[PDB]
Amino acid sequence: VREPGSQACLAIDPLVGEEGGAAVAKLEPHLQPRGQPAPQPLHTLVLA
Amino acid sequence: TAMEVVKFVNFLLVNGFQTAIDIFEDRIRGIDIIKWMERYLRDKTVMIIVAI
Incomplete structure (x- = not known):
């Protein structure tokens, strides 16, 4: 008989870098609000 | 999810x-949505993960 002492099997486990991983970022455009005095289209009429 | x-x-x-x-x-x-999907579906080497 032989003993597995020296030849024992190996388990594996990755060295995950999640602890130092950057996050996913969401973008939102800062709308030029119409609540603030934004301009409007100058629909014109004629006084005949 | x-x-x-x-x-x-x-x-x-x-x-x-x-x-x-x-x-x-x-x-x-x-x-092209369908083209985009087919690109990854056709490729045998790409691993697909199904989020149940």
Whole structure:
């Protein structure tokens, strides 16, 4: 008989870098609000 | 499960796997959605993850 002492099997486990991983970022455009005095289209009429 | 899938994609990208998902590939996916899907479905080497 032989003993597995020296030849024992190996388990594996990755060295995950999640602890130092950057996050996913969401973008939102800062709308030029119409609540603030934004301009409007100058629909014109004629006084005949 | 959109939020959990975003977290999962963060996990995979951090660990070096190039993950293709619709929310991030929006620009290319917008040109032709079905073409975008077929690109990854046809390729045998691409691993597909099914989020149940």
